[PDB]
Ligand binder design. Structure first.
Ligand SMILES: *[C@@H]1O[C@H](CO)[C@@H](O[C@@H]2O[C@H](CO)[C@@H](O[C@@H]3O[C@H](CO[C@H]4O[C@H](CO)[C@@H](O)[C@H](O)[C@@H]4O)[C@@H](O)[C@H](O[C@H]4O[C@H](CO)[C@@H](O)[C@H](O)[C@@H]4O)[C@@H]3O)[C@H](O)[C@H]2NC(C)=O)[C@H](O)[C@H]1NC(C)=O
Lengths: 43, 50
């Protein structure tokens, strides 16, 4: 049955001690930009 | 240089020739005119700082 069938189980432990996906590059429009931790505002 | 005018109460010194001297004098009149903006200098492209 379902309760007696073998199941492949992955247990993933996390160590909470330490990323974002890059967006499209927009030119000639004044944007607030993050570049590898460098934050600014400009064209 | 040390000088001593030969002064006595019956002697005078009178020039017999002259010269024409054209000298230079330099005077400032005006300086650079500048203008400032508050938000562009202090914060700059920041709405919450403005
Ligand atoms: C009152 O002062 C004025 C000027 O300060 C005298 O008037 C004349 O002065 C000029 C210039 O000194 C005499 O002209 C000739 O000067 C030559 C030197 O030239 C150098 O210096 C001048 C500046 O002083 C520069 O511009 C020039 O490029 C040079 O670097 C001399 O070499 C000349 O001598 C020759 O000529 C005389 C005849 O005049 C000969 O006897 C010499 O052998 C030589 O060949 C000459 O001296 C000019 O002569 C002056 N005029 C007169 C009438 O003498 C006045 O003399 C002075 N006194 C009075 C009473 O006014």
């Amino acid at each position: 049955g379902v309760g007696h069938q073998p199941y492949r189980v992955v247990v993933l432990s996390f160590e909470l001690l330490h990323p974002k996906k890059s967006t499209n590059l927009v030119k000639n429009k004044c944007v607030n930009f993050n570049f590898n931790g460098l934050k600014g505002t400009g064209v | 240089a040390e000088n001593s005018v030969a002064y006595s109460n019956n002697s005078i010194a009178i020039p017999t020739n002259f010269t024409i001297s054209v000298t230079t004098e330099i005077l400032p009149v005006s300086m650079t005119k500048t203008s400032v903006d508050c938000t562009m200098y202090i914060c700059g492209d920041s709405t919450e700082c403005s």
